[PDB]
């Protein structure tokens, strides 16, 4: 899909260097090799299987996200690099950062960034139960979107709720976020 | 709409009340369901079938159990009563329709035959203590991708489990696709008995 | 008490299969944290109990496992693959038989009703909240509400027998082991 | 009242503030304390002879107030404090118990983006998990009842063990001669701020 090309020749930065460039609200994107990742890639015809939102606590970099075999969580980006989901190894796939055009000239303690984070925090849960994981992965394969205030989210549905509730509009897969004319690539992580 | 031979085979089958069927059921009978759960629909879509689930009936005396892999749960054995009155701790009937069939080879075989003993042995040997979150995701993903179980692993789609049990007593199912419930329903040796009212 | 099982004959699992009868009482002395909490609060070597159910020649154990659920599974799991570990249950294992069911055949009405009640309580796993509640009740020594379907192992074994008339003298495995009508058969080698 | 320790009197006549008013007074690092009526809460209260069953660390994201904690039937999580007031663990109701705020003496004259506060938060974040499994919940509650601390470099934490790891890694030790909420409440450097109305 047209998000493919947009990231194909983006600069490759080492993780240590990128820390200083990342801003709260930046959009994390991944192309994973996990079975669930592959289902997302097939149904959406994309190289992108995951998305989430970056949140800086001081100098510390966290990723706020819905991970479909896990939950709506907030965790250190370092996990994707060094210990993905208790494997003690790097995420199996490639990793990218982008930034939304509207938030590029907005400081980390702006009103907008505050409300974006607020909404994400409000959706943090304590893991999905077995039933819900099954339901979420099934909706991906069926291409079906979710009920009004049902709280089970595909990664991109979660990124979408947060931006929705600050006005930025984008079913919805990671591809739709990557392909969006207002989403600007920053880097692939080496 | 968009469905196969298994479907017609069960379309005008006699409707029995659960209480009446109990006496007709025999260990090795094949349970079949057409569910409305998201995972049930994914199964129905990818396999182009009304059937989302299958399992093997086991009679302990007068009591009727169902041995099965339930993809959001585990490889378990539980009372058939659950599907009628209390499906997965919901206190309500399974959201879908229910059917019973019998394999031709086991129709003239008594419940303590050596075949039925081996069928039950294998099923018992695969019961687990639930699938972990990772495994449930992987199973449901395979369904959507139409990939069979490609390492020597113990994660089973409902029909895969039923198939392993029968495989290990010499009954093979035309598993052309991988194997979904449809291939069990559609199999020439599988005869319909009833829909449960 | 404890002593009742101390010098009981040690049988190999393969040999015991033929001796077991539906309704036999399974007993364990485990080294798991939850096992030890049961052993402490009840001052006993017994951490677990359950009811044996024979499907033809095959041997199942019907039980409430406090970090899992009210389930029925092959006894073979306790010997070879306890709770997806691919190893034997970390502890020792015993069989007893209740005096009343010794002269009663496997398809008697009593055995039928014992199995009926146990089947009626099988669930699809305990939720996280319920496990915590069960383990907390063990440590607090509190029994359960008559509505509540959350069971300490021994509370489950007790309900089954209660509904066929057999009463046991809150309730931990120790009370079942110690009961004058529960006779030891074997420790599993 | 005689079945209980020094931690208790320290919080008995503390001012009662409405939640809305306390938001402005709270600072990252402040210690949350609860006296719950849940079964697990009672086991904690008995074994530790305390009115306190829970503890956690407050973390401010701008004006929004979060609580970072290990909840023993759930996980090492970070969630809005508002949940304790309006929707505790999906019940849509307030936490069943009483709630308190305290502040450590060392952090009273330290601003919210200090280097210390940064490291406290770093450690907490590093321990956030995706829920405890059924096995671990059982193990944790068992340890509480057995009064045993965590032997290996093990990641299963009683609430106060979590609060203790975060403070330990910025130099603040709590008289842990195992550790329950009581030892945090009773600590001479922990000053009561308010009970939440
Ligand atoms: N959407 C997620 C799926 C996670 C699979 C492994 N936990 C990703 O592609 O990263
Ligand atoms: N194969 C199963 C899927 C599980 C749906 C609910 N747990 C069925 O169609 O019943
Ligand atoms: N009563 C049980 C406790 C659960 C052990 C962990 N699965 C036993 O001693 O075996
Ligand atoms: N430490 C916790 C115990 C578990 C509460 C159950 N939701 C508390 O007292 O709040
Ligand atoms: Cl995978
Ligand atoms: Cl960090
Ligand atoms: Cl991770
Ligand atoms: Cl569903
Ligand atoms: Cl069920
Ligand atoms: Cl343990
Ligand atoms: Cl087991
Ligand atoms: Cl409770
Ligand atoms: Cl909560």
Author numbering:
A (entry chain D): 0 to 169, 176 to 195
B (entry chain B): -3 to 173, 176 to 195
C (entry chain A): 2 to 170, 176 to 195
D (entry chain C): -4 to 172, 176 to 195
Excerpt from the paper describing this PDB structure:
To provide insights into the function of these biologically important proteins, as well as PPNEs in general, we report the crystal structure of BcPPNE and a comparative structural analysis to other related PPNEs.
The data were indexed in space group P65 and the structure was determined to a resolution of 2.5 Å with four molecules per asymmetric unit (asu) using the SAD method (Rcryst = 19.2/Rfree = 21.9). Each monomer consists of a layered α/β fold with a central, 6-stranded, antiparallel β-sheet (β1–β6), which is protected by helices on either side (αA and αC on one side, αD, αF and αG the other). Extra, unaccounted-for, electron density was identified at the entrance to the active site of each BcPPNE monomer and was modeled as an L-lysine based on shape and electrostatic complementarity. The lysine occupies the S1′ subsite and forms a hydrogen-bond network with several conserved protein residues (Ser48, His49, Glu67, Asp68, Tyr83, and Tyr90). One striking feature of the active site pocket of BcPPNE is that the tight fit of the binding cavity around the bound lysine at S1′ renders the catalytic cysteine inaccessible to solvent, suggesting induced-fit binding. Side chains of Glu67 and Asp68 interact with the free main-chain amine group and the side-chain Nζ of the lysine, respectively. In this conformation, Glu67 occupies the position expected for Tyr127, based on comparison with other NlpC/P60 structures. As a result, the bound lysine seems to have induced the rearrangement of a short loop (residues 66–69), containing Glu67 and Asp68, which, in turn has displaced Tyr127 from its (expected) original location. Thus, we conclude that the ternary complex of BcPPNE may represent a “closed” (or inhibited) conformation of the enzyme.
